[PDB]
Tab-separated table of C-alpha atoms (C1' of nucleotides) and ligand atoms in Angstrom:
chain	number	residue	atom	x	y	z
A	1	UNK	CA	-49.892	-5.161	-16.351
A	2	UNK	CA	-50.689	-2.789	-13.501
A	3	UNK	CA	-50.792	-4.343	-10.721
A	4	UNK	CA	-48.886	-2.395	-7.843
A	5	UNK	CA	-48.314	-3.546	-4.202
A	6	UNK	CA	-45.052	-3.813	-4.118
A	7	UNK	CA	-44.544	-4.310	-0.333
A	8	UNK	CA	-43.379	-7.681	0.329
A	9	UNK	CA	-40.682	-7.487	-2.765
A	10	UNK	CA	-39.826	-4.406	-1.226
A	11	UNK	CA	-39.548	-6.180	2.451
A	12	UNK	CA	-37.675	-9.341	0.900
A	13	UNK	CA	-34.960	-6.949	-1.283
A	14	UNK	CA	-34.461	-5.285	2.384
A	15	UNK	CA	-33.771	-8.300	4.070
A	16	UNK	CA	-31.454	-9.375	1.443
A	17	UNK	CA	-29.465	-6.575	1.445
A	18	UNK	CA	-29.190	-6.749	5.312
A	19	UNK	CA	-26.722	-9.801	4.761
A	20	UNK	CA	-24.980	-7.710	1.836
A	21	UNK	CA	-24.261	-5.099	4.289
A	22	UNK	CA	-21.820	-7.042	6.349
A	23	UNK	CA	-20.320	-8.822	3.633
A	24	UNK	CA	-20.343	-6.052	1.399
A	25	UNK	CA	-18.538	-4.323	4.457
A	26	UNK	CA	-15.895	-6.988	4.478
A	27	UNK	CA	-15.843	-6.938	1.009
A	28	UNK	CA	-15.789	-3.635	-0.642
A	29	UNK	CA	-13.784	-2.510	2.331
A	30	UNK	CA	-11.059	-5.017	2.130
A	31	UNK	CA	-11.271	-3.931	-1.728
A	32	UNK	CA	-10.360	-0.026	-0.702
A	33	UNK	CA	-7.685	-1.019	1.913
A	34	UNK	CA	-5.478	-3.501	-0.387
A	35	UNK	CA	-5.828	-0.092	-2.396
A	36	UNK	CA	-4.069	2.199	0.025
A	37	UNK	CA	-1.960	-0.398	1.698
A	38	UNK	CA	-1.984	-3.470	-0.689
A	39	UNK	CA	-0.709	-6.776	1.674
A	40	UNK	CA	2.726	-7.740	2.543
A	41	UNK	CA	3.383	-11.574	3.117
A	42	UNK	CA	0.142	-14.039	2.285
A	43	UNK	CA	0.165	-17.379	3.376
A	44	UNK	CA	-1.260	-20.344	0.922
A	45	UNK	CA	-3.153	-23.590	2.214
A	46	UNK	CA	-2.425	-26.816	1.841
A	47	UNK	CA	-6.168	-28.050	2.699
A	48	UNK	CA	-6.622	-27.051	-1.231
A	49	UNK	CA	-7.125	-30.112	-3.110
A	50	UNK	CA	-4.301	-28.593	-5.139
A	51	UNK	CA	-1.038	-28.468	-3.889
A	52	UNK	CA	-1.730	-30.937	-1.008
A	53	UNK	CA	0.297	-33.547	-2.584
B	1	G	C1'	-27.840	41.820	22.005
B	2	U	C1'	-30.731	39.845	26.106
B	3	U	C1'	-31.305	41.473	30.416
B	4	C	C1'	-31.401	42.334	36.837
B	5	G	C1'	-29.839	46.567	39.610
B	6	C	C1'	-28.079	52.061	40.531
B	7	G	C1'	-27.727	57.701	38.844
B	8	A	C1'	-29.776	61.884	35.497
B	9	A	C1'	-33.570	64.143	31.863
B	10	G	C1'	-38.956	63.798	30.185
B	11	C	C1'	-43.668	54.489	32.198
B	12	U	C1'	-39.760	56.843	27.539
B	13	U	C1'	-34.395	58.138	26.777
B	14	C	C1'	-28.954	58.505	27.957
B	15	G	C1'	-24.738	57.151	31.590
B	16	U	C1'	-23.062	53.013	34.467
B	17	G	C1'	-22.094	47.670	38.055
B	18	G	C1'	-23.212	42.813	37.294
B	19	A	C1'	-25.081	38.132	35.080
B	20	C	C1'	-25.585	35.483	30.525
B	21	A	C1'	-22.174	33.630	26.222
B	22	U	C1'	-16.905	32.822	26.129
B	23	U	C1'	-10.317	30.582	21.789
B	24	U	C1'	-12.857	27.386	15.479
B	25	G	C1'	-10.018	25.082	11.703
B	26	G	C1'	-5.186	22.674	9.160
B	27	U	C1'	-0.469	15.469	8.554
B	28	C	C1'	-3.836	19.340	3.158
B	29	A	C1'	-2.679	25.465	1.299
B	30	A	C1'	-5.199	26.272	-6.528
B	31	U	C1'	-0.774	23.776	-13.393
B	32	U	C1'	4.318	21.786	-14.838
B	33	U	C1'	9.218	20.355	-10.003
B	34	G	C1'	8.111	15.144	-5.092
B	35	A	C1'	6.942	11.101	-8.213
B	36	A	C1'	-0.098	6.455	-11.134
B	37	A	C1'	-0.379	3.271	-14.673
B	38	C	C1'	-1.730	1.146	-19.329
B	39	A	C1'	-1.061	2.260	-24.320
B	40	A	C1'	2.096	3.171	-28.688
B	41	U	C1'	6.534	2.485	-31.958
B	42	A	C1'	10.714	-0.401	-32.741
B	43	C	C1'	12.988	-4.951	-31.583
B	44	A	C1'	12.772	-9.818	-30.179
B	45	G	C1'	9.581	-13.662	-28.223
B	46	A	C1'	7.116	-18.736	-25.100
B	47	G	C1'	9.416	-24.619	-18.307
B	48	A	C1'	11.484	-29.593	-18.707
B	49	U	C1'	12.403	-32.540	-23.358
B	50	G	C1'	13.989	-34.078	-29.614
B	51	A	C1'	9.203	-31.736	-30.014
B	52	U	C1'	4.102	-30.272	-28.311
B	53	C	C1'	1.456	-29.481	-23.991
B	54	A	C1'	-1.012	-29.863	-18.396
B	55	G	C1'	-0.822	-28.890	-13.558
B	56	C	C1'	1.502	-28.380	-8.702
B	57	A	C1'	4.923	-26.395	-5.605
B	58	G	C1'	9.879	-23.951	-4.039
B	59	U	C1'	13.559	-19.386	-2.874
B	60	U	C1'	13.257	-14.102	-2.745
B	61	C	C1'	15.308	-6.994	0.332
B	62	C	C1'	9.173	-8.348	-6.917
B	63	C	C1'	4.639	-7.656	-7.160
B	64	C	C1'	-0.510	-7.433	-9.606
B	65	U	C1'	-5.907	-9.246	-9.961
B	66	G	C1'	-8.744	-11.356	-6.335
B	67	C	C1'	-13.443	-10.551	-0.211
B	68	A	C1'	-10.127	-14.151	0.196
B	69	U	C1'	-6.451	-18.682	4.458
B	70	A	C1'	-10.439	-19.725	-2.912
B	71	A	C1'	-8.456	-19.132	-7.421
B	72	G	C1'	-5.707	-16.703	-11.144
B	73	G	C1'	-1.521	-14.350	-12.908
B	74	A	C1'	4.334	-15.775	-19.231
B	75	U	C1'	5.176	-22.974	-15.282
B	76	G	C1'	2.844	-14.811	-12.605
B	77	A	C1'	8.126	-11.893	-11.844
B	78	A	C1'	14.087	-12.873	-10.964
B	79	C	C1'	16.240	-18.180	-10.197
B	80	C	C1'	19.275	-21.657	-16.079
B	81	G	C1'	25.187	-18.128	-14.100
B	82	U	C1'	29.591	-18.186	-11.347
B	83	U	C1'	32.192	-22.635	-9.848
B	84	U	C1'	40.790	-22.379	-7.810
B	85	U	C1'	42.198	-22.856	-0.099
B	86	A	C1'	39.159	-25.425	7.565
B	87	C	C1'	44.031	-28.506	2.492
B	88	A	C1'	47.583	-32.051	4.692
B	89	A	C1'	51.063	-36.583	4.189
B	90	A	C1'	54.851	-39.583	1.384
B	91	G	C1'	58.605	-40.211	-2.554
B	92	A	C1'	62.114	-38.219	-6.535
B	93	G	C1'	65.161	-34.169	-8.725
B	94	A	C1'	67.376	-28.993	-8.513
B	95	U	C1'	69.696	-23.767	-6.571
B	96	U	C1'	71.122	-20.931	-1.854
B	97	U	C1'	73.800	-21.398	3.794
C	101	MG	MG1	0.304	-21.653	-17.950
RNA sequence: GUUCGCGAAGCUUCGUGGACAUUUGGUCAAUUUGAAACAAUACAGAGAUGAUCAGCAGUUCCCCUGCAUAAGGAUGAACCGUUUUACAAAGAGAUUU
């Protein structure tokens, strides 16, 4: 143990999180607005395997 | 305060006219009384059907978890009850005018 250079880890863990941000953003943010205003009328889908029959 | 001019005292100091810069922030004010939930105790307690069990839906002025148009919630919640009139036609018997 002991070898350094970290760089391209680094590079790679940035680039990952670069997709995280949007869905993250999506995510987490559709997380905090169900908190203050928590939906009203969903609608299921019958393209589910389930229920389709 | 910066300063660009005027007027008095000794470039230094007072007295003035201007120019420069110009209206922030609050849907809120710090503990009970403007609304969080679980938990806990007690009491019961699990869809059809005889019983045991799976899953899917459905209705709703019920929602929750979920990124969710996935999925999951006691088959997620309440539905299991009440239920007498667009009501006429025919026949028989009885009291009143
Ligand atoms: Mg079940």
């Amino acid at each position: 143990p002991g070898c350094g250079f970290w760089q391209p880890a680094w590079r790679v863990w940035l680039n990952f999180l670069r997709g995280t941000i949007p869905l993250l953003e999506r995510y987490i943010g559709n997380l905090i607005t169900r908190q203050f205003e928590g939906r009203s009328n969903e609608i299921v889908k019958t393209t589910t395997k389930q229920r389709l029959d």
